[PDB]
Design a protein around this ligand. Structure first.
Ligand SMILES: CN[C@@H](C)C(=O)N[C@H](C(=O)N1CCC[C@H]1c1nc2c(-c3ccccc3)cccc2s1)C1CCCCC1
Ligand SMILES: [Zn+2]
Length: 90
């Protein structure tokens, strides 16, 4: 099951980005869709399922790609995107 079931809702995850500092550079819509919520500190986000954290986002970073790059064992990632997607990133 998820590490943090309370953030399993995409809508709740999106709401968490109200004070996101990088709206143009990395859209909250994409971050939330990819399982991430904003911690509220700097640009630090975390996946509700695997609890993997990511920071220091660069302009044009793709949340799903970074999710698969750093946390390829996440079951939310697997269910959402499939194994072929994860394999291709590695
Ligand atoms: C360029 N794209 C971005 C999204 C990215 O790849 N970020 C990575 C990342 O955040 N990682 C790598 C796996 C672990 C994670 C880290 N999280 C933290 C946190 C952290 C703590 C709580 C929540 C979120 C992040 C604090 C200090 C260092 C790291 S490295 C690295 C890349 C190399 C420079 C430092 C960050
Ligand atoms: Zn995850």
């Amino acid at each position: 099951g998820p590490a943090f079931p309370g953030m399993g809702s995409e809508e709740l995850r999106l709401a968490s980005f109200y004070d996101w500092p990088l709206t143009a550079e990395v859209p909250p819509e994409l971050l939330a869709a990819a399982g991430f919520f904003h911690t509220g500190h700097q640009d630090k986000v975390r996946c509700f399922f695997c609890y993997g954290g990511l920071q220091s986002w660069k302009r044009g970073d793709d949340p799903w790609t970074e999710h698969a790059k750093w946390f390829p064992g996440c079951q939310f990632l697997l269910r959402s995107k499939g194994q072929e997607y994860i394999n291709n990133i590695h």
